[PDB]
Design a protein around this ligand. Structure first.
Ligand code: JE6
Ligand code: JE6
Ligand code: HFG
Ligand code: HFG
Ligand code: BR
Ligand code: BR
Ligand code: BR
Ligand code: BR
Ligand code: CL
Ligand code: CL
Ligand code: CL
Ligand code: ZN
Ligand code: ZN
Lengths: 491, 485
């Protein structure tokens, strides 16, 4: 059983959910966590779905080295802030100090783009569309949290180069829509699509698009994935050029990069798990249905205790043959109540209870993990009804979370409401001038990590800004509002 | 085109095959290489096949961290591990190591997860990257500082379960080589000198590179017995009598070395030759007969017919692509896809179109065969099987041609200098093996490759003795020896 509640002590409840749910094992290297099989399976489902999508689009998979040279890391950088990256440095091999230290990759721009330059010998080599499924390392000295913010993490990073800007812009949005679908269609999590402000975009790119999710327990937002248009910034840095076929001049390609991580799993937990443990979205759950025989007594029999099991096994096999990931729990040394708790902790979407009674009556009881409701299904209907049920669960889980998100997304034009909404765990849609210094003042004034940050400029604007009358929300700015921006406390 | 020959200058030829075959890009950190998509697709076929296999056996996938603490590493009881000592410009309180293998990462977790008898067995696998920072000469795919692999770690209540699993995994590795890669291998047990020092015995599959004349370990599957469980206190209490029991453990691994062996065995002086079951593209269609007088409607017509055939192949599960580029001649495309090793090239011109046929050319043979279009879906798979069989059988002939059996040291050395591997009676002593290696160099001394599961004859204890003239001992078994990588 869980020993903390999502409302009273979120970090404790989260630690208990990931350990008692057998997702994570803690490690003696801080900021790094063991992914047990139960959570790695969810990553597998996410990874395979996304890879199939981008493969169908024409991206191809490759693998570049974990180590980056110091020369490549520092390439073409001239400002002093650029020269002390927080990368992990390998300085020796056994007892031999190395000639030149080499860095663990925090991301792979620096080692892929020299190769892109070599590989693009003419305009006919374009586009180049590659992706890696790999592990990167960012050794920051802040508070790490499993899944959400770790020093080593698994991800995919796609790096694309095109002859025209139009191609690249289109791809930025196609990839962002895939990431949105990861959250909504696989994980039943609503997200907000938008552009980062100038303050929050990737500094090496032209613009950054994002999907943001909302953690109602803390009232905080978290960036779920990212999709950048780099424009020509890196092509000019790394001389990724080709000769124009018509004008014959040297032209720089247009690039994107895009990435998503195991943070997905963290968001799933933070949004869906409850005070009894995990609640797995049906489409990624390793096991969707567990069958628990019950009604066995001390004097049930032995020759009947096996009959009940036989019927449970028959139903299990039917489910598996219908494409439903199902298992039976026939362990004799654990009570049915124990098994109930154990599989609720692991968040299996449907528990089946099957007792002698219901065997007698051609039926069984299906129990939804997300809301606890029980339903009697005639065995003849198992194959028809159980898929429908799993779809319903996904939909309830999504719509539940969506209503949460919308009821805590508050539109206002008034600074006082901005502050009040922020202290009551909302995120806020407000007219915004877009300026970096104004964003700084908004953050500094809203602090009581408690200052509000911009989350994204949402593609779906809640209303149309009137450039003629609408001003920025902050009382001391006074500039024309360029758009509505989403603000909140950012995880 | 390739500018070295496999039989004259093997390393230059190898480098030209992996670069012009678009497998590898060289890289400014020595001993690490970029895997382009053409080679990574091969690793992916191997990896997905092996994973489906062990998943059906009930092994489950997990992922452990790439960093190992110094204490953890030191529990194993000098090693060329890569040490992280700084983050940015802050020196770390304690240096952490890049995993060279995950025993010291995983087995503490195992000791914790095994709380009672009912938790056994534990059978976990990871697909990950490991680092071994050796200063010896590296070679792409074959010996690298960073490599991709899978490492499996299992724990059982009894030794016999574990012995069986060792053999099961070894058999899968053999199948990767023979069935996926068309490479014959010799299953065997390592000698006491060559086994993994931390286990009880090591099993292996050994392959032979005829060009080099050298043998190479293609995979490994260890029985660790109780060594590691005693080291890491991986215990349970026996349910009746409640004595403390140490679990029995195995580990097993295979790497991108597979791809290296593939090249070394099958590639030729025109480039790669991909075994059909791992080739990312199996069939490539090249449109032929386009003159400078070929009009644009006729070019559209030929391309659309090629694309129709291409998609008919893809729908029937044959991985086929068409090369519809107009800046490259048909002959250029022939050379290009030959360098890349695509098993079948289809040549489809206008005469072919009018006769409802095409020509399929085998990359391995060069042999051409005309096929009526209606029979495409039925003949093309057969051919692909034929290619696999040819490739395997060619390699197996080449391996048995280079496998020699003797009982006399003189013939043994004559064979070693003729680029052969030699089966000889052996006592199995470490000192004697050292002596055998020492008295064959003028590394080019003779090392033991494996004690083969399938012996060439019965080492009669009353008659047969060790092959070295200075060992007086009775021969325990026939051991396969040779020069190795
Ligand atoms: C698990 C995970 C995820 C992510 N990030 C980043 C943005 C992104 C998004 N969206 C990536 C583009 C895809 C994401 O998920 C980042 C991280 N570690 C870190 O920042 C390093 C760290 C370690 C300890 C404490 C503080 C910081 N750890
Ligand atoms: C690509 C690859 C493979 C393998 N090894 C090992 C044995 C094994 C087998 N069998 C593994 C158990 C599965 C194997 O494949 C090993 C390696 N690097 C190294 O030794 C590091 C190194 C670096 C430069 C020069 C010399 C040595 N690199
Ligand atoms: O990592 C990025 C940009 C993009 N890379 C491709 C996948 C998607 C991803 O958002 C931004 N970023 C983030 N963190 C970093 C940390 C360090 Br340390 C360095 Cl050197 C560089 C970076 C750095 O470039
Ligand atoms: O890595 C092994 C033993 C097995 N681990 C699991 C997968 C299969 C593999 O053969 C042997 N080995 C090989 N090379 C090593 C290099 C270093 Br450096 C260290 Cl510390 C340790 C080792 C080390 O333990
Ligand atoms: Br950034
Ligand atoms: Br990032
Ligand atoms: Br070893
Ligand atoms: Br090894
Ligand atoms: Cl696990
Ligand atoms: Cl590409
Ligand atoms: Cl590539
Ligand atoms: Zn403003
Ligand atoms: Zn001897």
């Amino acid at each position: 059983g869980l020993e903390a509640t999502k409302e009273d002590n979120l970090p404790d409840w989260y630690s208990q959910v990931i350990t008692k749910g057998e997702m994570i094992e803690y490690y003696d290297v801080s900021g790094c966590y063991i992914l047990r099989h139960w959570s790695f399976a969810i990553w597998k489902a996410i990874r395979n779905w996304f890879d199939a999508e981008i493969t169908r689009l024409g991206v191809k998979e490759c693998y570049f080295p974990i180590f980056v040279s110091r020369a490549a890391l520092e390439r073409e950088k001239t400002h002093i802030a650029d020269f002390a990256p927080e990368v992990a440095w390998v300085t020796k091999s056994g007892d031999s100090e190395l000639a030149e230290p080499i860095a663990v990759r925090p991301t792979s721009e620096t080692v892929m783009y020299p190769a892109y330059a070599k590989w693009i010998q003419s305009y006919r080599d374009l586009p180049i569309r590659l992706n890696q499924w790999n592990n990167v390392v960012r050794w920051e000295f802040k508070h790490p949290q499993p899944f959400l913010r770790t020093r080593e993490f698994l991800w995919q990073e796609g790096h694309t180069a095109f002859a025209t800007q139009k191609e690249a812009d289109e791809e930025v949005l196609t990839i962002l829509d895939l990431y949105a679908k990861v959250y909504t269609d696989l994980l039943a999590i609503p997200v907000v699509k938008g552009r980062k402000t100038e303050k929050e975009k990737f500094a090496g790119g032209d613009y950054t698009t994002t999907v943001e999710a909302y953690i109602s327990a803390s009232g905080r937002a978290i960036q779920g994935a990212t999709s950048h248009h780099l424009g020509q910034n890196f092509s000019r840095m790394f001389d990724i050029v080709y000769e124009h076929p018509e004008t014959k001049e040297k032209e720089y390609v247009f690039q994107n990069s895009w990435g998503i991580t195991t943070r997905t799993i963290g968001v799933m937990i933070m949004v869906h798990a409850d005070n009894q443990g995990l609640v797995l979205p049906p489409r990624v759950a390793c096991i969707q249905v567990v069958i628990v025989p019950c009604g066995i007594t001390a004097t049930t029999t032995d020759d009947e205790r096996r009959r009940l099991y036989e019927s449970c096994r028959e139903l299990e096999q039917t489910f598996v043959k219908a494409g439903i990931r199902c298992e039976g729990d026939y362990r004799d040394n654990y009570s049915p109540g124990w098994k109930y708790n154990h599989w609720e902790l692991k968040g299996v979407p449907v528990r089946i209870e099957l007792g002698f009674k219901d065997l007698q009556n051609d039926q069984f009881v299906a129990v939804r993990r997300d809301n606890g409701a029980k339903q009697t299904i005639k065995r003849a209907q198992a194959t028809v009804e159980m898929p429908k049920l799993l779809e319903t669960i996904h939909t309830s889980m999504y719509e539940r979370a969506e209503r949460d998100l919308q009821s805590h997304t508050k539109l206002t034009k008034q600074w006082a409401e901005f502050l009040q909404f922020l202290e009551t765990k909302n995120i806020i849609m407000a007219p915004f001038c877009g300026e970096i210094s104004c964003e700084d003042r908004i953050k500094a004034e809203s602090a009581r990590a408690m200052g509000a940050k911009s989350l994204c400029i949402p593609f779906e604007q809640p209303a149309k800004i009137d450039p003629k009358v609408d001003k920025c929300v902050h009382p001391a700015c006074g500039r024309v509002a360029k758009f509505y921006t989403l603000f909140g406390r950012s995880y």
